[PDB]
Ligand binder design. Structure first.
Ligand SMILES: [Zn+2]
Lengths: 184, 124
């Protein structure tokens, strides 16, 4: 028995029907691929080292390397998709909406997506110290982040032809559960 | 890189995707392995409803396997004795055989991606 309430990603993953097929677009170190063992997840990340770390940490994990937008995931094949803290790294509104649409394209008609981004309510375009191994030395550089304001993520979803099912706030992040729009 | 994953993976080229040629990639394996995994007939039968059976056969062919039903098995009793042979053999192929080293050629753009210990990579 767990006593603490589940965080939203764990909650969402545990709510998936048994034997659902899912995609983790920007899986990072595979942190969430093991939350629900009744479920089959294909994880991807743009980072070759993060994926490797994901694989080493659990070789049962199914992880691949690909861009989050121009990805390797077949359209409309998946029961669910998670995108946790990845699309706030794209620096044009155009490419942020593209990323959302990519997430949506992944889904079966009844498929659902969780998208999770840094909130402004923590200027929206910022620089954040970030560690990067280069020639064996861990340098500290700056990487781009877009902080999201209220309803901005639902806007990006609706503009992508998605439907917003639920919205919340958690630990300085905006999240949305969304699905394809009843069109498509 | 479980064999199953082949069925959930396609070329990342915007053109092959735009023109319905991304899926499926044709596969060759310089190396393979079997890794023990818990057997779940119920999960296997569910998966059948998320699998492109046509594409599944092709990739099995490209990897040198014709031991595979012509079309999607119609199973309603996952625990039935009658389906255990076919299910065990599906678990063996789909879940337990992993590619460690191999390639994934797209037949529309020409490009060849690599699977190396044991990660598929889909970058230009
Ligand atoms: Zn191609």
């Amino acid at each position: 028995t767990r006593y603490k309430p589940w965080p939203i990603v764990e909650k969402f993953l545990r709510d998936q029907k048994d034997h659902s097929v899912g995609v983790d677009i920007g899986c990072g170190n595979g942190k969430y691929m093991g939350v629900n063992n009744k479920v089959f997840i294909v994880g991807s990340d743009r980072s070759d080292e993060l994926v490797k770390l994901a694989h080493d940490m659990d070789p049962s994990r199914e992880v691949v390397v690909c861009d989050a937008i121009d990805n390797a995931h077949p359209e409309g094949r998946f029961d669910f998709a998670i995108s946790i803290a990845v699309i706030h790294h794209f620096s044009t509104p155009e490419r942020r909406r593209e990323a959302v649409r990519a997430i949506l394209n992944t889904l079966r008609p009844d498929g659902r997506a969780l998208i999770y981004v840094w909130a402004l309510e923590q200027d929206q375009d910022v620089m954040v110290p970030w560690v990067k191994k280069v020639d064996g030395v861990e340098e500290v550089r700056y990487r781009y982040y877009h902080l999201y304001r209220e309803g901005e993520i639902t806007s990006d979803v609706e503009a992508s032809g998605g439907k917003v099912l639920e919205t919340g706030y958690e630990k300085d992040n905006w999240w949305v559960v969304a699905k394809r729009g009843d069109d498509w | 890189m479980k064999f199953l994953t082949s069925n959930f993976v396609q070329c990342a080229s915007k053109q092959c995707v735009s023109s319905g040629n991304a899926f499926p990639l044709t596969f060759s394996a310089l190396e393979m392995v079997q890794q023990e995994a818990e057997f779940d007939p119920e999960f296997l039968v569910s998966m059948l409803e998320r699998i492109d059976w046509a594409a599944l056969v092709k990739v099995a062919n490209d990897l040198g396997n014709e031991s595979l039903p012509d079309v999607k098995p119609e199973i309603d009793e996952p625990f039935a004795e009658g389906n255990q042979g076919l299910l065990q053999e599906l678990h063996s192929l789909l879940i337990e055989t992993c590619i460690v080293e191999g390639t994934m050629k797209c037949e529309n753009c020409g490009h060849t991606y690599f699977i190396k210990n044991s990660i598929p990579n889909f970058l230009l």
